[PDB]
Amino acid sequence: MLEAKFEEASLFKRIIDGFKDCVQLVNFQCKEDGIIAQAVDDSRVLLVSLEIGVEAFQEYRCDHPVTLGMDLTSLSKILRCGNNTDTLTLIADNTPDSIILLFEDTKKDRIAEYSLKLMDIDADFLKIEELQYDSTLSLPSSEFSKIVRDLSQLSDSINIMITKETIKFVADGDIGSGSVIIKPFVDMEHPETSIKLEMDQPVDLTFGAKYLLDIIKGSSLSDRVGIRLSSEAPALFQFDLKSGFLQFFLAPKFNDEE
Amino acid sequence: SMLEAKFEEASLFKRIIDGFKDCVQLVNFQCKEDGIIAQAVDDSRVLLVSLEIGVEAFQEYRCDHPVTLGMDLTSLSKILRCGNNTDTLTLIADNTPDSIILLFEDTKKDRIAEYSLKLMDIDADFLKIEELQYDSTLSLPSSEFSKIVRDLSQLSDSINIMITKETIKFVADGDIGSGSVIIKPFVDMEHPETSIKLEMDQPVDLTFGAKYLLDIIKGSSLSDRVGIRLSSEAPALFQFDLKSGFLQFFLAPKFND
Amino acid sequence: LAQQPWVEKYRPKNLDEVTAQDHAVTVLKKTLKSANLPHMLFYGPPGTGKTSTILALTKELYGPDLMKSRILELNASDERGISIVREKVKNFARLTVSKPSKHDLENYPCPPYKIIILDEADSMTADAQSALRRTMETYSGVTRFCLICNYVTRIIDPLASRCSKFRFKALDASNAIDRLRFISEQENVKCDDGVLERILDISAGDLRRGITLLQSASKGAQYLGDGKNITSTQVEELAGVVPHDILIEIVEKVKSGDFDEIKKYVNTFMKSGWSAASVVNQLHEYYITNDNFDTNFKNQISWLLFTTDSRLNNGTNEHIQLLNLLVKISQL
Amino acid sequence: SKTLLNAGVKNALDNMSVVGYFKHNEEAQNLNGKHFVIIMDEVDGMSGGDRGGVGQLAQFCRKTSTPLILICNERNLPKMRPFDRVCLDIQFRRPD
Amino acid sequence: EKRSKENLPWVEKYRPETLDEVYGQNEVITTVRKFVDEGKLPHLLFYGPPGTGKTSTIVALAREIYGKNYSNMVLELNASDDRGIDVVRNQIKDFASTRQIFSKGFKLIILDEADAMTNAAQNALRRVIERYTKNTRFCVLANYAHKLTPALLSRCTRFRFQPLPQEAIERRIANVLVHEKLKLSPNAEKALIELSNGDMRRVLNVLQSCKATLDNPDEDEISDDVIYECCGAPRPSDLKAVLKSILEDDWGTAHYTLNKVRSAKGLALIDLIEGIVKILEDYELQNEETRVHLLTKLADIEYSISKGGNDQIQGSAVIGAIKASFENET
Amino acid sequence: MSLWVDKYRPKSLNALSHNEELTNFLKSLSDQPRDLPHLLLYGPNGTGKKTRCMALLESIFGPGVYRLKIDVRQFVTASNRKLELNVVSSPYHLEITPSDMGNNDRIVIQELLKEVAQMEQVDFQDSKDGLAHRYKCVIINEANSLTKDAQAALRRTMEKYSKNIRLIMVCDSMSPIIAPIKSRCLLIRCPAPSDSEISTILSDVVTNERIQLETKDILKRIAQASNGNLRVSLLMLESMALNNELALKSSSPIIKPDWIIVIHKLTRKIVKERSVNSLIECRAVLYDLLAHCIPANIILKELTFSLLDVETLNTTNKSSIIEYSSVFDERLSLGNKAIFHLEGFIAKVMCCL
DNA sequence: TTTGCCCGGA
DNA sequence: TCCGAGCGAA
DNA sequence: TTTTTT
Ligand SMILES: Nc1ncnc2c1ncn2[C@@H]1O[C@H](COP(=O)(O)OP(=O)(O)OP(O)(O)=S)[C@@H](O)[C@H]1O
Numbered sequence A: 001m002l003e004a005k006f007e008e009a010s011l012f013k014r015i016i017d018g019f020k021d022c023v024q025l026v027n028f029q030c031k032e033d034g035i036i037a038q039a040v041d042d043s044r045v046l047l048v049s050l051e052i053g054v055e056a057f058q059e060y061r062c063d064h065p066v067t068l069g070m071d072l073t074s075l076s077k078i079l080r081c082g083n084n085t086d087t088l089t090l091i092a093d094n095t096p097d098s099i100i101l102l103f104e105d106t107k108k109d110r111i112a113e114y115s116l117k118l119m120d121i122d123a124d125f126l127k128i129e130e131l132q133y134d135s136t137l138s139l140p141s142s143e144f145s146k147i148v149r150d151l152s153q154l155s156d157s158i159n160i161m162i163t164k165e166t167i168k169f170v171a172d173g174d175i176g177s178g179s180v181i182i183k184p185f186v187d188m189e190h191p192e193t194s195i196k197l198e199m200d201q202p203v204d205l206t207f208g209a210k211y212l213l214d215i216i217k218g219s220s221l222s223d224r225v226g227i228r229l230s231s232e233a234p235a236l237f238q239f240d241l242k243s244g245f246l247q248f249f250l251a252p253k254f255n256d257e258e
Numbered sequence B: 001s002m003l004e005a006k007f008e009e010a011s012l013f014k015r016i017i018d019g020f021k022d023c024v025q026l027v028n029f030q031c032k033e034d035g036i037i038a039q040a041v042d043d044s045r046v047l048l049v050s051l052e053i054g055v056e057a058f059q060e061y062r063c064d065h066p067v068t069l070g071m072d073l074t075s076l077s078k079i080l081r082c083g084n085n086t087d088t089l090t091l092i093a094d095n096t097p098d099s100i101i102l103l104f105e106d107t108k109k110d111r112i113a114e115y116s117l118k119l120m121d122i123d124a125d126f127l128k129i130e131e132l133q134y135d136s137t138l139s140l141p142s143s144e145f146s147k148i149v150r151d152l153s154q155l156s157d158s159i160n161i162m163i164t165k166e167t168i169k170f171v172a173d174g175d176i177g178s179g180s181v182i183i184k185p186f187v188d189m190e191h192p193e194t195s196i197k198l199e200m201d202q203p204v205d206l207t208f209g210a211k212y213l214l215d216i217i218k219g220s221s222l223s224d225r226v227g228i229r230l231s232s233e234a235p236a237l238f239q240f241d242l243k244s245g246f247l248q249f250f251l252a253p254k255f256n257d
Numbered sequence C: 001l002a003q004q005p006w007v008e009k010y011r012p013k014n015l016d017e018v019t020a021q022d023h024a025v026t027v028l029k030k031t032l033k034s035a036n037l038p039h040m041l042f043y044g045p046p047g048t049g050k051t052s053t054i055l056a057l058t059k060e061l062y063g064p065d066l067m068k069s070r071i072l073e074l075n076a077s078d079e080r081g082i083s084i085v086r087e088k089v090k091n092f093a094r095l096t097v098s099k100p101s102k103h104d105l106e107n108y109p110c111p112p113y114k115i116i117i118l119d120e121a122d123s124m125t126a127d128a129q130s131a132l133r134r135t136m137e138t139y140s141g142v143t144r145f146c147l148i149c150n151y152v153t154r155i156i157d158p159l160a161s162r163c164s165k166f167r168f169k170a171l172d173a174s175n176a177i178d179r180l181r182f183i184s185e186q187e188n189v190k191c192d193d194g195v196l197e198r199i200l201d202i203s204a205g206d207l208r209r210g211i212t213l214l215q216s217a218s219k220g221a222q223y224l225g226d227g228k229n230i231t232s233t234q235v236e237e238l239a240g241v242v243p244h245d246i247l248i249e250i251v252e253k254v255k256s257g258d259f260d261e262i263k264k265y266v267n268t269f270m271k272s273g274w275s276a277a278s279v280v281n282q283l284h285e286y287y288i289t290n291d292n293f294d295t296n297f298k299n300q301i302s303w304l305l306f307t308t309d310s311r312l313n314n315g316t317n318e319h320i321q322l323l324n325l326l327v328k329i330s331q332l
Numbered sequence D: 001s002k003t004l005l006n007a008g009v010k011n012a013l014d015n016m017s018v019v020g021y022f023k024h025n026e027e028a029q030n031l032n033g034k035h036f037v038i039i040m041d042e043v044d045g046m047s048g049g050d051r052g053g054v055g056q057l058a059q060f061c062r063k064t065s066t067p068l069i070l071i072c073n074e075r076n077l078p079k080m081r082p083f084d085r086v087c088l089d090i091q092f093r094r095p096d
Numbered sequence E: 001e002k003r004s005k006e007n008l009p010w011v012e013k014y015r016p017e018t019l020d021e022v023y024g025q026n027e028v029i030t031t032v033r034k035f036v037d038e039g040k041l042p043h044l045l046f047y048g049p050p051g052t053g054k055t056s057t058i059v060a061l062a063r064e065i066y067g068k069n070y071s072n073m074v075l076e077l078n079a080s081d082d083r084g085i086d087v088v089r090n091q092i093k094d095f096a097s098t099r100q101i102f103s104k105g106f107k108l109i110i111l112d113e114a115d116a117m118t119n120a121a122q123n124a125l126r127r128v129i130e131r132y133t134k135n136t137r138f139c140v141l142a143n144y145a146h147k148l149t150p151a152l153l154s155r156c157t158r159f160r161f162q163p164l165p166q167e168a169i170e171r172r173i174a175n176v177l178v179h180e181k182l183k184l185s186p187n188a189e190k191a192l193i194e195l196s197n198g199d200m201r202r203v204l205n206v207l208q209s210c211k212a213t214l215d216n217p218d219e220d221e222i223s224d225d226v227i228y229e230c231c232g233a234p235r236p237s238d239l240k241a242v243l244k245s246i247l248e249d250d251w252g253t254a255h256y257t258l259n260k261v262r263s264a265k266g267l268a269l270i271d272l273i274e275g276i277v278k279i280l281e282d283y284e285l286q287n288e289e290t291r292v293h294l295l296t297k298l299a300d301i302e303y304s305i306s307k308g309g310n311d312q313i314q315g316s317a318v319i320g321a322i323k324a325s326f327e328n329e330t
Numbered sequence F: 001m002s003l004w005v006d007k008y009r010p011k012s013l014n015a016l017s018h019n020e021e022l023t024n025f026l027k028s029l030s031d032q033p034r035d036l037p038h039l040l041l042y043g044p045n046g047t048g049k050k051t052r053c054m055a056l057l058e059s060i061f062g063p064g065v066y067r068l069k070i071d072v073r074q075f076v077t078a079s080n081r082k083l084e085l086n087v088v089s090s091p092y093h094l095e096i097t098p099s100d101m102g103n104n105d106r107i108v109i110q111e112l113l114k115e116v117a118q119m120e121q122v123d124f125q126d127s128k129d130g131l132a133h134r135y136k137c138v139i140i141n142e143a144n145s146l147t148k149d150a151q152a153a154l155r156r157t158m159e160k161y162s163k164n165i166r167l168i169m170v171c172d173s174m175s176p177i178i179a180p181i182k183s184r185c186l187l188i189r190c191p192a193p194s195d196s197e198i199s200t201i202l203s204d205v206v207t208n209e210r211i212q213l214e215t216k217d218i219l220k221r222i223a224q225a226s227n228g229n230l231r232v233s234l235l236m237l238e239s240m241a242l243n244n245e246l247a248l249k250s251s252s253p254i255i256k257p258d259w260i261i262v263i264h265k266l267t268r269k270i271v272k273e274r275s276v277n278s279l280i281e282c283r284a285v286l287y288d289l290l291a292h293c294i295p296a297n298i299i300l301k302e303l304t305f306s307l308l309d310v311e312t313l314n315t316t317n318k319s320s321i322i323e324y325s326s327v328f329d330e331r332l333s334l335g336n337k338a339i340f341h342l343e344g345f346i347a348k349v350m351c352c353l
Numbered sequence G: 001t002t003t004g005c006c007c008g009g010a
Numbered sequence H: 001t002c003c004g005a006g007c008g009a010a
Numbered sequence I: 001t002t003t004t005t006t
């Protein structure tokens, strides 16, 4: 009924590892358009959203939409059991109690079959409406991740501030404070390393360091990361894919002082 | 600012700090117009480290008035790690400061990383501890001293240095046995860096704790030759020469039981 | 405004808003000029103004901008073992004081030290307290400590010796009615004469409880939507006070002295959920101020009530303790 | 410990002794000279420096092809329970 | 330190700098000063209650022995430092067995608040103390001898610091008054000495609070009224009024009197109990049973107060305890 | 769920059916809930305290408060030991029983609760901007079981973060609640229903379940045997119906739970035989009760009030028994090994008889 | 004169 | 699937 | 996780 063959299993393994620490049980709503998933974390400070597109898969077809509830730990274990060079295929029937994973290698000699039991997860419906954010920024993921790793060593909270041609990451702690200031920069020879900034209103927000540490694990998916910030919304972290994206909506810390 | 000192590359300062990090915890830097001196004393008060960095180690240097910066070495090393070995590192301080600014800036991009480390109220004099006329002064390559120390430390917790006319003797006596290395002065005009130099007025015989010497030899990464100055009544001086200044260890000898 | 419970909404903002602790607030206010604040030990019963006082003092000393860099607050919600005291607290006490800005120096006294607030210090182990002793003395030049507690005997003698003691007095109708009336007027609460003083009598020295009771009564009145005054009977109902008729029934059962009758009445009484401590308090008031009982009876009952109150303070079964007390009174 | 026991004495449970061989090589018809008697003295003294030791010794008491003698002072201790059904218990009492 | 010494709390601003500024411990000071003079310094133990001058004395001794640069010539450790077995075997043993870095001479190790060390560390210290005596001397300081091992106690020369007697406190107060330009009435000085229980820290803290409580400290005089105000303590007259009412009046009047006296200045119940116990100790009683009942019941009430409880019930308990105990007097 | 005590539990303040004045007070609190103080509900067991807490939350946040799920949260002790806590949650509130972790309950307060207090939450079902515009609610069950350290850890969290969090604590007695915590709470007394209210509730159940009932007096008997415990009365009604083929009769007897029967047997034994051998047999009975999850305090209470009901004892015996019960109830509070104190109580009682 | 549950590993 | 280590932790 | 001896 439903079958989805990836060009390479490494892509799927990386996507799964991206958000497996934030959430463990999740429903994938496979549709003719593609796979769309949305999960809330246990503490409800984080929403993860996935919109893998049809173009991402090497081949894909699912006539009737089907929801597959699965635990990410077992899927990660099965993917680890698989080889680096493989064309992972997910197979499911009209009313599947399990999903079949086929690791078809380039050489026909190597063929592997696995079965993963599905689950019945009571997942509600979430309406994520687009919002006019106060600021948008885009920058390489290695840089952002290095900033987060360095600043988390100084404090439990990291403050992101955006003002006119200035992006500021700050962390204050017992031994002192650390700050990184980036400016909008464009490199024609190497566009992938450019820093882009759209600024409508000044923004300042604070986030738990552990959450940003969890989020930066998605850097592998996309060489660039987009961050959208508003005074009243959660902060949106987007890693683009070939046709989909991995999305993190993070609530900020409660501002006790103000 | 009042104090601005720019290292071309942060790696220089990181290696200098790593040269004595393991022996002490709290360090007091005094910055003056002629450069930066620093002192620290180990927890047991048996070892003292004295660092000197001249203005030539810096691409640019400016210190309008003398200033004292006390800090914990673990926090400083943690911060130094957060910056890249290639970036330019500027130490900045203001008059009567509550913190020291470490500014990592790379010219390739417009990325500035500014760290501020809160300073301690460490009020302690340096005393410029250095006896005028040491009994014996010797110098030898750092690798050989490291090897002798490492070999003899496997045998005993204490190492004795005996200097007599034209002979330097290291000795260690322990549970499984004893070891004794004897070296003699020698000048090799083909390879002066391998030379062993010995000048001496009074013969000397002093015992030292092995763990302290094992810490001291970590300075070998900063210099190819080590100088050793010994006297009957003074701490032993182990000096490693830098391109601009120096790193000194003053180690007190064991009491003659 | 409309989002704060009244206890937090009306927390004193400055030292002049603390109402009945002048004997200590005066000393503290003098240090805005003398700038030689000693190590402090605030102690006293619940809801008397200790935390409010230390917070207001720090604000007055450093201004809103410089406060954060000059304060280390650690309370019972934080980990405060001996390792914490030996590393985090010691390290903060060692530091140079944050530099004040020019504006800060113009508008605030800015003394040359920082403050470590150990709120609820009576929950710290004796060994961690011991570890504080020499840190307090060696770094007095740049750091001052403020320990806050309800039970002063839980602080080890060396630390109590090092600290300057400030006892916070119980707040009653005599010395807190002005503040309670101010709050009542700000919130437009209509009350009969006697009601605010009755609130403070019920609160038994705790102004936080009195304010919360006033807020509950005003919520009731607003919900009723009739514009009438809050009465004392309503306040007593909100405060879990036993109605005088029920107490008289208890007293008559005790007078009769029949064990089975007392037992059955107590069993029925417990079903109403009356707090045993309030019942014992009301019985104490009834008997000790009764001209119909003689000296020997009152001596014996005073000891009985003391014993039962002590046993209840340990978390015991209220039914058992109350029945035992009533039987013992009946056999006097 | 279990590791040391498995790497050491275990190999002698079913092995001839070279010392025994060369001691009585000249002696004719010495059947026992080449075999081991394994003595594990002071079993009750095996503390945390011998993790897993007592269980492994009980295993050996079941799976040994050469005679094994264990010695302890406190037989009734709980840690000596594993030996219960696999050893020939010989009590020594205070002599008169 | 920061700015002047005038920014310090009086308990630290008036810390003795030399042995001549330590008061009320004359026998100890004489003995130790002549130990230093003759070059015979044994291993010392300073034992005593809080705020009697132990740390002050040992630091003054170090200053005298080594001069102004003493701090880099001694090893000072206290309860704020880790002093486990590993520290004893490495840091302490290394310092004891090694020459001075800065200036030649013998080593001094000061174990302040030694009652905070574990048994194992103290036992490790025994042969360190004995083996390196030729070049090193230890000084141990404690408030509680029972946490010190018998072996450690055997090796030290013991000196007991007494609660400071009246004359020493009076002289120190005179010095403070001169330096602060303060005036103190005789009754106020008596009240201060009485409430300090021979702890100089209490004297200095109370005096600083009293100065802060004056309107004009240049002209205003610290009277006993000021002391009681800042300490929130009962006047002796209040204590006597309460006790008289309890011993001579009916229950209604005694309850009324206790409540009214307490309400007058917001007095705490435990302070009244302490004061009345001090008063009753001087009573001559016919029956030992009166003393027994008084002491046991009042101790029970004090213990219950330490855990909180109902204040009104506890006050009535005090009244009843005293009345019932004196019934035995017949 | 299927059992009648659960099938007919009310889900709103309008569906509550006893103690009308308390219902009015709760409605008054829910009228303007933005400045709601922290709450502490107290009263006898099984009267409807949690039912009312849930009804209040429904009145504030809507029916969504009843859409519950359970999740396991991990913690580590200083000794590095792993611990798990089951947390019940709706989109609007959390429910925890920190006493589940025993003496480590303090950790739950210092890490989990604090975290909830310091964070904002996302919400993509009620908020137009993805953030929840409301304080977070935490129910703490069995609050009188918290250790003193955990209660202390609550104090400043309740004040500092009052903007973002409100606490509802539920307990059957306030005696073990430390004074600072009670000072911080609005105390709500929850009395037991009268016997008429219980009879009305039971009659409604009898009608909705088509149970044959010879006379209404039966319900009254049940109501009287439950001693105001409404949960007990509903469960007893169900059990009696099940044992009488869904047809209650005037002769149908009241069913007592197994542990109660054992305790009554122990009472008869203590009264009949006062001796060391009897005390040893009593120890056996006590171990049996404790091993099967009958708490020591429950055993002491039940035994004391069973003894005081014995018809053959005189006033002197009964006064001695209640004194000993008071003393050893305090002992149980202050100690660890319950059997020690229970045995001491039984020994003193045997001596007094 | 030694219990009950039941580890980590096979 | 079987076995009991080590700790008392309801 | 370990207080004292004569
Ligand atoms: N002296 C006071 N003046 C004005 N308000 C007071 C006073 N004391 C208590 N309150 C009020 O009650 C609330 C609590 O005051 P706190 O200072 O926090 O009491 P506390 O002495 O710290 O109580 P504990 O020891 O933590 S139980 C304040 O926010 C005020 O609203």
Ligand SMILES: Nc1ncnc2c1ncn2[C@@H]1O[C@H](COP(=O)(O)OP(=O)(O)OP(O)(O)=S)[C@@H](O)[C@H]1O
Residues within 6 Å of the ligand: C157, C158, C161, E010, E011, E012, E014, E015, E016, E021, E022, E023, E024, E025, E048, E049, E050, E051, E052, E053, E054, E055, E056, E057, E142, E143, E164, E172, E200, E201, E204
């Ligand atoms: N004999 C004394 N003479 C003068 N001042 C004293 C004396 N004793 C205590 N003080 C004063 O009280 C302060 C504390 O004195 P310390 O010598 O540190 O007390 P201590 O005996 O070490 O108390 P412990 O045992 O650490 S609680 C000093 O700084 C002095 O101001």
Ligand SMILES: Nc1nc2c(ncn2[C@@H]2O[C@H](COP(=O)(O)OP(=O)(O)O)[C@@H](O)[C@H]2O)c(=O)[nH]1
Residues within 6 Å of the ligand: F004, F005, F006, F008, F009, F010, F015, F016, F017, F018, F044, F045, F046, F047, F048, F049, F050, F051, F052, F201, F230, F231, F234
């Ligand atoms: N019909 C009705 N049943 C109630 C009411 N209050 C409580 N109950 C029932 O009694 C049961 C016990 O109530 P519960 O809140 O769990 O008791 P508590 O939390 O221990 O005080 C519930 O499961 C309900 O079925 C009420 O007001 N009306």
Ligand SMILES: [Mg+2]
Residues within 6 Å of the ligand: C050, C051
């Ligand atoms: Mg407080």
Ligand SMILES: [Mg+2]
Residues within 6 Å of the ligand: E054, E055, E056
């Ligand atoms: Mg001292």
